[PDB]
Amino acid sequence: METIAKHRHARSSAQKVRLVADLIRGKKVSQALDILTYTNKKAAVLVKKVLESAIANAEHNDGADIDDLKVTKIFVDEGPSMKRIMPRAKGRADRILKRTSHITVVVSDR
Amino acid sequence: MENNSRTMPHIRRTTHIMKFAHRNSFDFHFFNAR
Amino acid sequence: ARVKRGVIARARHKKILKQAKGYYGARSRVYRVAFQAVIKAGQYAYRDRRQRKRQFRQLWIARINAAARQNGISYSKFINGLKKASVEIDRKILADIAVFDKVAFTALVEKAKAALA
Amino acid sequence: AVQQNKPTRSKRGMRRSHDALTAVTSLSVDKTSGEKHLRHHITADGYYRGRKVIAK
Amino acid sequence: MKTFTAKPETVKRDWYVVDATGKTLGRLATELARRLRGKHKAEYTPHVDTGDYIIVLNADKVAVTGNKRTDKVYYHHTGHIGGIKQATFEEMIARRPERVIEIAVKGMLPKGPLGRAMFRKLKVYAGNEHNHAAQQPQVLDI
Amino acid sequence: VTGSGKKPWRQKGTGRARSGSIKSPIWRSGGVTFAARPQDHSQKVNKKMYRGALKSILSELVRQDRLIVVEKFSVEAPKTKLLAQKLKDMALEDVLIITGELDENLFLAARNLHKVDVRDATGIDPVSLIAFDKVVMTADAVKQVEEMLA
RNA sequence: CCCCGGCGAGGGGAGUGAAAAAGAACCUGAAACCGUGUACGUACAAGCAGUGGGAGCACGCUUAGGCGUGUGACUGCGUAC
RNA sequence: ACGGGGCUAAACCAUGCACCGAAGCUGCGGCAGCGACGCUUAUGCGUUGUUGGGUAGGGGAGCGUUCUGUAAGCCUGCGAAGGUGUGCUGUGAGGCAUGCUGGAGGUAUCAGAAGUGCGAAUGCUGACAUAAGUAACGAUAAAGCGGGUGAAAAGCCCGCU
Numbered sequence A: 001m002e003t004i005a006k007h008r009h010a011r012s013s014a015q016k017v018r019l020v021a022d023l024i025r026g027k028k029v030s031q032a033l034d035i036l037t038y039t040n041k042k043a044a045v046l047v048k049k050v051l052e053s054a055i056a057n058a059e060h061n062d063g064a065d066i067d068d069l070k071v072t073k074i075f076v077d078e079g080p081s082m083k084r085i086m087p088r089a090k091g092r093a094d095r096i097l098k099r100t101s102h103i104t105v106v107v108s109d110r
Numbered sequence B: 001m002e003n004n005s006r007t008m009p010h011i012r013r014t015t016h017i018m019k020f021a022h023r024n025s026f027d028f029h030f031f032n033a034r
Numbered sequence C: 001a002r003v004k005r006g007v008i009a010r011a012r013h014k015k016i017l018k019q020a021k022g023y024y025g026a027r028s029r030v031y032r033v034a035f036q037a038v039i040k041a042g043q044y045a046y047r048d049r050r051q052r053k054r055q056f057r058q059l060w061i062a063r064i065n066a067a068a069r070q071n072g073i074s075y076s077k078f079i080n081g082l083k084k085a086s087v088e089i090d091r092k093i094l095a096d097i098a099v100f101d102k103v104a105f106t107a108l109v110e111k112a113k114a115a116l117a
Numbered sequence D: 001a002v003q004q005n006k007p008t009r010s011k012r013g014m015r016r017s018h019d020a021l022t023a024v025t026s027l028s029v030d031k032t033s034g035e036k037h038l039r040h041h042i043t044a045d046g047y048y049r050g051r052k053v054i055a056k
Numbered sequence E: 001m002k003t004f005t006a007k008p009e010t011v012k013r014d015w016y017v018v019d020a021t022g023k024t025l026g027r028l029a030t031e032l033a034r035r036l037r038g039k040h041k042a043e044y045t046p047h048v049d050t051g052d053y054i055i056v057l058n059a060d061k062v063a064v065t066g067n068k069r070t071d072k073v074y075y076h077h078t079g080h081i082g083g084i085k086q087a088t089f090e091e092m093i094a095r096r097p098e099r100v101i102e103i104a105v106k107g108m109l110p111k112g113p114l115g116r117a118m119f120r121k122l123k124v125y126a127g128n129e130h131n132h133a134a135q136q137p138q139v140l141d142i
Numbered sequence F: 001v002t003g004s005g006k007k008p009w010r011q012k013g014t015g016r017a018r019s020g021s022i023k024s025p026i027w028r029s030g031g032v033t034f035a036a037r038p039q040d041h042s043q044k045v046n047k048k049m050y051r052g053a054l055k056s057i058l059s060e061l062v063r064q065d066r067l068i069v070v071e072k073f074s075v076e077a078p079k080t081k082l083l084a085q086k087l088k089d090m091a092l093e094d095v096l097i098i099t100g101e102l103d104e105n106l107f108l109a110a111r112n113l114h115k116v117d118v119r120d121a122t123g124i125d126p127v128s129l130i131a132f133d134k135v136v137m138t139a140d141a142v143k144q145v146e147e148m149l150a
Numbered sequence G: 001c002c003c004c005g006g007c008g009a010g011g012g013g014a015g016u017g018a019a020a021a022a023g024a025a026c027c028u029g030a031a032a033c034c035g036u037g038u039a040c041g042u043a044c045a046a047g048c049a050g051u052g053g054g055a056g057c058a059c060g061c062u063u064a065g066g067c068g069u070g071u072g073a074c075u076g077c078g079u080a081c
Numbered sequence H: 001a002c003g004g005g006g007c008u009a010a011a012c013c014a015u016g017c018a019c020c021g022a023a024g025c026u027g028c029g030g031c032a033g034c035g036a037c038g039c040u041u042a043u044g045c046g047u048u049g050u051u052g053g054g055u056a057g058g059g060g061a062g063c064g065u066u067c068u069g070u071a072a073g074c075c076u077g078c079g080a081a082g083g084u085g086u087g088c089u090g091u092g093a094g095g096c097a098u099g100c101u102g103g104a105g106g107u108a109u110c111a112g113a114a115g116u117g118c119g120a121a122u123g124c125u126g127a128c129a130u131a132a133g134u135a136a137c138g139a140u141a142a143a144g145c146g147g148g149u150g151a152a153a154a155g156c157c158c159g160c161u
């Protein structure tokens, strides 16, 4: 049985989180957690808390065992963007996008 | 004057930005086809 | 009597993009580029219904020319000989016998060599 | 200087074919505590190469 | 019924050996380009390589008519500016004589991926000996 | 449209398509290009064409067995139940009743029957002679239509 | 109400409801645009990227075979609106 | 300064017979316009001759959309409109059937009326791309360490420089 945990509206762009999500796709969750511990990215902190939550959902809500779970699916989607105004020279105004993302981790023992 | 701009409400006279002959770096030697 | 356009305009755009499947990039996604690519595919398809009839006759003639020279005669003397012997087989069947029945092609060559001599 | 044509999503993914991260391959195991750590770094308990080096 | 097309997994290719001693350069090269392409077979298909393998011996003894032995000039450019280079027919024969037949045959072949694969079946040697005896090439006195 | 006549930006220099009004029909919230007025849709019919059309419709009601002539058609009290019982005694469901001059027992009793219109002989019109299945005229109503139609 | 988490944000269960992919960023939920999975192609190859021909592979059929769908090596022609 | 390879003919002149070559012509199948004659029409069919590149522009004939009548009718919670696939069909604009989604509307036929069809106007409004994870992070007066708090401290608090 699969088990999903998600972080919606995570304050980072999807391109920055997708670099970290490509490291742990298909790995055992024991191995995937220690890859995330020694990756020096802010997105590695965000993906680790979603993976830790998918692990705990599978033990509690699904009765699984920890030593057989693998990261079957992991994908990052784009969330809504927050529009901000940035003053430039000579009266110019630019528009700042503050991109968010939806992280989804699926752990399965099969 | 541009009095109801919603993209840039803070400014009314903007052709010092994109019109080349109204920029502060315009030199009249660029107009040599005379 | 105010008419809105949303249902009609969407069905017209969806009809063009269905004909643009398989095309590269914006040619299968973007209506302004796909409509332009569907029309150019229609001018090519009209033109190549005429060129299909030229390209197959060109292929049949080169295969008859190869199989006739395996029997000691050129194309232009083999066609003249079959016209003198009043054989009305066309180039599509002659190029087919040349591949699949090489003995029956030899019988046609000796028929054409006989009418010339 | 600016583009004359919009580059495609194909050309964008080709440029990003060198942007991939490399994973750390071998965490060591400290020979007294059994804790994982980076090579030539102390553990999170402050052991290094078998002994308590940082009493924190 | 649709017209036959040759399928590349079931194409019969044969091996031949040609002696180029005293032959005219261009009249030998047109027959070479016919058989490398496959124009002599009834199974000819314009997008399938249905040709033959040809060994050419004595490439340094090919003949040309007229004053072409000193007047035929071979040009190429190197890619650097001012880098146009020339060589006469006799300078090509004295330095690398297998290139004279290879250049003439390459200009008579189709241009593209298929014509580059037709060129690969041409084996040119400057002397009387080859080492393709395991392929059993048949003597083609053209 | 509410708004001023101020030019939104200047004619030359901003790198952008020229404008003269915020109320232009090209713009969102702008005017309608050929915005409508209240109009009169009534047509003229010649008197002889109106009377010639009625005689053709009446001739088709005689031909297509849709015209019924009685001598008496009224009810006795202004009750809807009386007329509904009367019409199903005649196998009439959807019917136009044309009488000589109108009784108010009959006019009140058919106000609630949606398939039944009661008219007098001068208030006929060409559409209700076609829109109802059967047409019942009293015998004194028929002679008034003849003098109306010459 | 229980669980992960910072007594967070966010989520997974449970429960309500006809429906929760009706969960308050809430009816329906198109397109541009951005991803994950699968089949096929692609690292000796030159151009409006299609069209005509066409091998191979994969998946469905149904047979004493060769049709359907997807992909498209190679090749003729071809300079958008 | 043959399109190239190449050519002593694969060049030039004269004569001759073959063949290739176009959407030209012929063959087979189909559609339409304008004439002529007729199984007889009631305005359609049959036979025959001929015609069918097209801008500006003139003439003819249709499709579809919203609203009104026909309609207190007909279809629809045994699933309407809309959305998304597939199959069939017409010369075309299009039409019909059906799987999934959706959850309450839709509308034949023959007429009537138009805010009736969009890719362009440096069109207008909203959404989303590209350059690109690039430039930059606002005075070159400057920071270093210990302790505390905290899920987490280069930037907060305390202390010493």
Ligand SMILES: NCCC[C@H](N)C(=O)O
Pocket: B009, B010, B011, B012, B013
């Ligand atoms: N008088 C000064 C007005 C300033 C205004 N924001 C402008 O850009 O004109």
Ligand SMILES: [K+]
Pocket: F002, F003, F004
């Ligand atoms: K005003």
Ligand SMILES: [K+]
Pocket: G022, G027
């Ligand atoms: K819903």
Ligand SMILES: [K+]
Pocket: none
């Ligand atoms: K959504």
Ligand SMILES: [K+]
Pocket: none
């Ligand atoms: K979508």
Ligand SMILES: [K+]
Pocket: none
């Ligand atoms: K092609």
Ligand SMILES: [K+]
Pocket: none
């Ligand atoms: K539906």
Ligand SMILES: [K+]
Pocket: none
């Ligand atoms: K536009």
Ligand SMILES: [K+]
Pocket: H132, H133
């Ligand atoms: K970007």
Ligand SMILES: [K+]
Pocket: none
């Ligand atoms: K600074």
Ligand SMILES: [Mg+2]
Pocket: A087, A088, A089
């Ligand atoms: Mg600045």
Ligand SMILES: [Mg+2]
Pocket: A091
């Ligand atoms: Mg300022």
Ligand SMILES: [Mg+2]
Pocket: F015
């Ligand atoms: Mg501009």
Ligand SMILES: [Mg+2]
Pocket: F029, F030, F031
């Ligand atoms: Mg308005």
Ligand SMILES: [Mg+2]
Pocket: none
């Ligand atoms: Mg009057």
Ligand SMILES: [Mg+2]
Pocket: F111, F112, F113, F114
């Ligand atoms: Mg009523």
